[PDB]
Subunit: 395 residues, 5 copies
């Protein structure tokens, strides 16, 4: 007619159309929603409140049996857009979410032909996830998102995947690669959910694989922790007996405590787990404290009237395996002989006070061995963490 095609097509469709009833002619046939997920960016991974922020491009389609027309009647048009609030829209929600509402709504949907309705929308999802930092510098996380209908059972709503699973697994078309986390794989999975003997529901789980970039954390933390070899080589060659070691070890302890003072403002906080690097740091702290204490005992003993046991019961264990594994003229001469002792009184002080450096080292040597074993353990665990991080790129 003279009326333009789109206006009278919308009049023919939307008038005498009841939004709020499931668009099926036979109620025994469930409606099928085919959803798709495209990854855009990873905005934040809190790893203290166990929640991550993500931004996802989302689309889905279903069949609306009451929106059908013959094209050549309405001037041969095969697609139009009508407002979302005037048709039936299913309720698809995420099971795990903390706060949603910063994602806007799109008030337009295509109704292509034969009832094909398509919805395009962005998503600002803040979803709870179980984030572990056991291997902090080299983390690989394994988070899930579940799509389902909160009310409709599987006899009313089915969920299917839009594309083939392989395309969804490797889809990095619009991802931002200038952040901190690197996307690896989005793995879809279908499940039937039921926690009671009456009703069952359809779910579509998406597993998101992310991986940290360790360069920043390596150059900012590991090399100052490589300085344990510096402290070892400055504490080894320096005389272990009374000298400047006590003071210089104290200064290095203050420095290595200032380092962990700075580090605590950068390492993540979590109330259920701690990084293994922190375990190695506190082990190094304990060994430094025991080293300082042992140096204090050795300094004190050989300079404050050493009365150590010559042959105590511990000597047997000391020697069993440690040495294997690791008129007035007469009065004038009398007083001259009496005052001649000043030379001895000036000389016999060092010989008194320089006794037992030999026995003091039996503990410094063992503690040096402990330092080297600790450093070797740190190196091997760092290498194996890097290996586990690097082998995760196969998926």
């Amino acid at each position: 007619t003279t009326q333009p095609a789109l206006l009278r097509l919308s009049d023919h469709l939307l008038a005498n159309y009841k939004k709020g009833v499931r668009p099926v002619r036979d109620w025994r046939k469930p409606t099928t929603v085919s959803i798709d997920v495209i990854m855009y960016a990873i905005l934040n991974v809190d790893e203290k409140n166990q929640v991550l922020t993500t931004y996802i491009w989302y689309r889905q389609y279903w069949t609306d049996e009451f929106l059908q027309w013959t094209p050549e009647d309405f001037d041969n048009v095969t697609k139009l857009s009508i407002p979302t609030d005037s048709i039936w829209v299913p309720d698809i929600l995420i099971n795990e979410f903390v706060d949603v509402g910063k994602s806007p709504n799109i008030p337009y949907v295509y109704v292509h032909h034969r009832g094909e309705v398509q919805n395009y929308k962005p998503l600002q999802l803040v979803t709870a996830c179980s984030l572990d930092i056991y291997n902090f510098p080299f983390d690989v996380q394994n988070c899930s998102l579940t799509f389902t209908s909160w009310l409709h059972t599987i006899q009313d709503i089915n969920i299917t995947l839009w594309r083939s699973p392989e395309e969804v697994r490797s889809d990095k078309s619009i991802f931002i690669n200038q952040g901190e986390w690197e996307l690896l794989e989005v793995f879809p999975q279908f499940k039937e959910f039921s926690i009671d003997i009456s009703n069952s529901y359809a779910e579509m789980k998406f597993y998101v694989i992310i991986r940290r970039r360790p360069l920043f954390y390596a150059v900012s933390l590991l090399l100052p922790s490589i300085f344990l070899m510096v402290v070892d080589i400055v504490g080894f060659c320096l005389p272990p007996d009374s000298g400047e070691r006590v003071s210089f070890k104290i200064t290095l302890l203050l420095g290595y405590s200032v380092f962990l003072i700075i580090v605590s403002d950068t390492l993540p906080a979590t109330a259920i787990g701690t990084p293994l690097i922190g375990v190695y740091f506190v082990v190094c702290m304990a060994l430094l404290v025991i080293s300082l204490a042992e140096t204090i005992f050795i300094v004190r003993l050989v300079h404050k009237q050493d009365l150590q046991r010559p042959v105590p019961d511990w000597l047997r264990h000391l020697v069993l395996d440690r040495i294997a594994w690791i008129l007035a003229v007469r009065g004038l001469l009398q007083e001259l002989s009496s005052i001649r002792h000043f030379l001895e009184k000036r000389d016999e002080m060092r010989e008194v006070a320089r006794d037992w450096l030999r026995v003091g080292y039996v503990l410094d040597r063992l503690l040096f061995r402990i330092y080297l074993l600790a450093v070797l353990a740190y190196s091997i665990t760092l290498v194996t963490l890097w290996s586990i991080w690097h082998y995760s790129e196969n998926l």
Copy 2:
């Protein structure tokens, strides 16, 4: 007829239906809402603002006497879903809440048959609770949630439990066990509420039992506080008199103050209570300060012209119970005898300055006893706190 069943059933029901009036044919019969609560996760327990964040799956049903139909008239269908905003929905609210609004709405409800209407919805509840941290590492909390109608009295609205109470007590089907707090029991309870002589209301209280996981806090706090035995064994065997103790005790005091500097960033803050562990920490601080002061007095006395009272009035109390519980030739000889005194002047300095180590220990020994009693008290209170924590799993 030719019209499909669901559309004309919705037309028959919703047309000439007035939302806003209580759906009863006789106004003397109150409507009964049967509610249920399923526990999902404990997102946050603030324990500083006395509020916890929780996520609960919720459902309820009531009877709508104006939504009834004979199935075989409408093509034998016995269930349909209609929008929530087109029927009467009761107002069930939580008495204690700080901020709600991050939980979305579900715009669909089943109207099964004979007026059975079911509502399914998630809940993001941020509810105030009285959280105590007296036994911080081993806490067991006891929080409540109250469901009632804010306007309708008990003559208009009754609240009943959906399932049997035993099922609600032990329902951990969908709980997340990868967090910090562990769920123990959800105990329902019915009460009739009235704060005036005219109106009474129906409530349904739910008591949520949670329990902290102490592993993280134990390995991160207790063992550095186990190092009090390290400080005791390094302060005992080291000479108590003038030597290196003053300085070494000062260094340990700086270290044990750095520890509580770090701890204050991890211990919770509350303006109405403090953990008992903090009480033991400050007691240890006070004892360390008194030890350092006593060492300073002992160092000062025996090296700066000791003029202590030989037999003061305190000697009686010192000995009563402490020792039980715990031509020119003549001038030449004259000047030789005069200058012979240099040996004595060089020798009689140590004997002057090494007087009274015996009396100085009467206080170091007692203070060592005080340290051991404090450590024993710490150990026994830690054991009893763990026992109280472990016996709470029976419920």
Copy 3:
């Protein structure tokens, strides 16, 4: 008739009813709103942004002359509930508020009989108040809430109190007593408000009296500040002259600075006032600094060639009131006499360097007096603050 009573009663009332016009038959009679306030909890008192968060149960009623019916016509029912958005609701707002919107709405109101309409609603009020912390540990606050209509004058809207004032003064039926602040009195007051010569408005002020619980702040702050007697008794009996005091006072200054380092994370921050306890703390700091400086001068003078003025002009003021208020044989003997002076050269060093401890104390004694006066002032002001806090419970 056959139609049930509630439905046709709602039809008779709400149909041909215009929401948006004040429900009076004669426009010269103002409508009267009778409000009531019940106290539930005090969620937060910020005392840095001068705002407090409160939770109040609220109710009010007015007369709607267009909602009237004869009961026995409509099957003898004398109460019903109708949606709030379908009738006229007055605009009652708080004058002082920072952010509202976290309190939900109740979409139901009773219309009892003869036009009696009742509204029940919770309130999440975040209202600005003038909070002072002059007596921080023992605060008693005096905050107001004002209820009025923002547009309607007193010729259109009147505000009256629901119950008698005495009941509102003492109403602690549902208060939570497990928080930090204690409720004392809610005092209603009526006022007529007008800031221009044309229009006047009706207000209903509510004064909320709250009171801090000082136990936590006392046990956490006062006793370490009771340790000023510890520092006084360790600085008094220790020799004031050159010895270990300079160093030990330095150590106590570092400790008493670490204390205020910790305290600054717990004391409240306010840009218009400071607690008097902080004034006493900084006075103690200044006195400690002046003590350390005076000890440095006394140490320096009596050990570095004292050339003080014997009788300067200050001696008169020093003594006026301070002492009241507070062949070759000849050469051989010659060289022997020359070398005999070594005894004097070894002995006359202490006598040179031990001059004037007597004059040094004239300042240490006065400064000790200053410490005791400062401690007495601290004690008396703490006692009077506690007395003012305790006498406030009469109201």
Copy 4:
């Protein structure tokens, strides 16, 4: 008639009334909005994000030519209130704003007579402003608010002031004077805005004058910075040469660094400017560092084998202007003479090591002069800042 007056008056007005068209009979006449601004409180001045929070009581009126009636027809009533959402309301917005939405809406407006419509509403405005802290303790700020229509040009909407400008300049009727900032003047101003050659817009700028209260900041910051005279008088009279100054200056440097450690938690942060007081503080820090360094050189030189140049090229400049601006008997006697040198070897050590205190002071005296000039500059700039602050109350 029998129908009450207000209901049929509202029926006569609102029926057949089209909201959404500008209420003028002739479209060539712009509508005039007469606005007013009343100041209530200044909630926050961020001075780090360059934004302030304000609370303003607001009102405006315009003429609605379609809402007119003869009073004696409708029972002689000359005012009524009708809902805001049923009439035409202009769009008046602030040009500069960061976040609005915490101010509620008032759903009622008076339509007095002959089309006089009045709107009363509160405002929660968070507006960006250029805040400078050059004179932090004594700031006077100069912030603007602009009211205009975002779409309608001046041919459609005009903005006029309700009252006379003088009344708006001095209007402190409802201001809260218990905060931090003091209101001085609200200066209205009219401008015609146009950034293109086609369209012009009408604006009404309001300049808000505020002023800080300096008491808190003075008593909390200036007096500890008055202690520079304390450090000057303790560093002047103390011997400048080797003694206790190096150590005592180090202790004062640690104290004066602890002071600025505390201050950094209270001084405001701004990325475009710094207070001049901070400049004086860092100048004092630099002068203290140079003083400590110069003392170290002087201590080192006169005690470690001084080999300074006697007459270098700098001596000319040193003296030009600085001094103006500022058998066996023979062997027995031989060995006696040889050993007689012990007296000289014991005596000639001080005379060697006490050389050149005279030359060392040439730098300490000059640096003392620098300290006094710095203190004088600090005092004069503080006085002039106070004078500028005090003279701002004339407006």
Copy 5:
């Protein structure tokens, strides 16, 4: 007619007008939206969450074929404003955004003539961007904003630029120049977007060029880092051998660590990059630590019984290139000769302990060379960063 023109024109237009259909008579012609962007202010650049906050004045127009009229029929009016919610409005969104919703809506649009509809609105955009701080003090950022339709393809919606590109490039008419960042260029760009073989979309990218103001950061950070020349000139001229250097270098290390303690509260935090200035700071820290260690070895060696290798294998490399690139009378005489050795025993101690200052400097000199090279590198990199910053103003 008697009815005023605007009311009946609005009646003629809006009645029988269907909002929700694209306003084209022929559906094969896409609608064209001509957009414009005007820059107002840069509120925040987070550079830790990789997001910036911006405020933009925005406008656009399109053609509405169903809103057309002949002017002289409706009393010769050629423009009117009608509510936005009563006509068709396209959906133009930004691809990258984190949170929107603090920008209000303007419920009025001009419909000029022949279907010309204009929309004016402000925008509060919080958009994600890739912010780098490699050259922190002198940053130039390069951020994008993309405008497109989220649903409509290019066959339905086209996007064109309102003005010429040159005007948009240089448009600083209403910019605020009192902030931290300086606007340089807004560069528009058109692109056709398609990530699939079926649908294509039209985009309009806007590149926003901003530039930091370095004055504040220069005066607050660079000059204290210019004090490395102060530390170099106080560590060079001071004797490198045993003396006061160890202690004075320790004090400078504590000062230069306090500086970076203060700096960490002002430097930005980013998990993907670090400023080069921080790299130079940590290099200076490492060199200071190695200097202190080398001084400790040199102090220890020449004072604790030096037993260094005289001619080790390292001597060849030491000398190859380093020196090029950089009765009783007999007994009386016997005892006199025996006691005559006291002079030698008092004299031969310094000569023993003053051995090898010559060899110790071979490392201090090299380390001084390292300091000068580090300072030169710092200066040249600062100059080149300033040059890159200054040359960016050409665009």
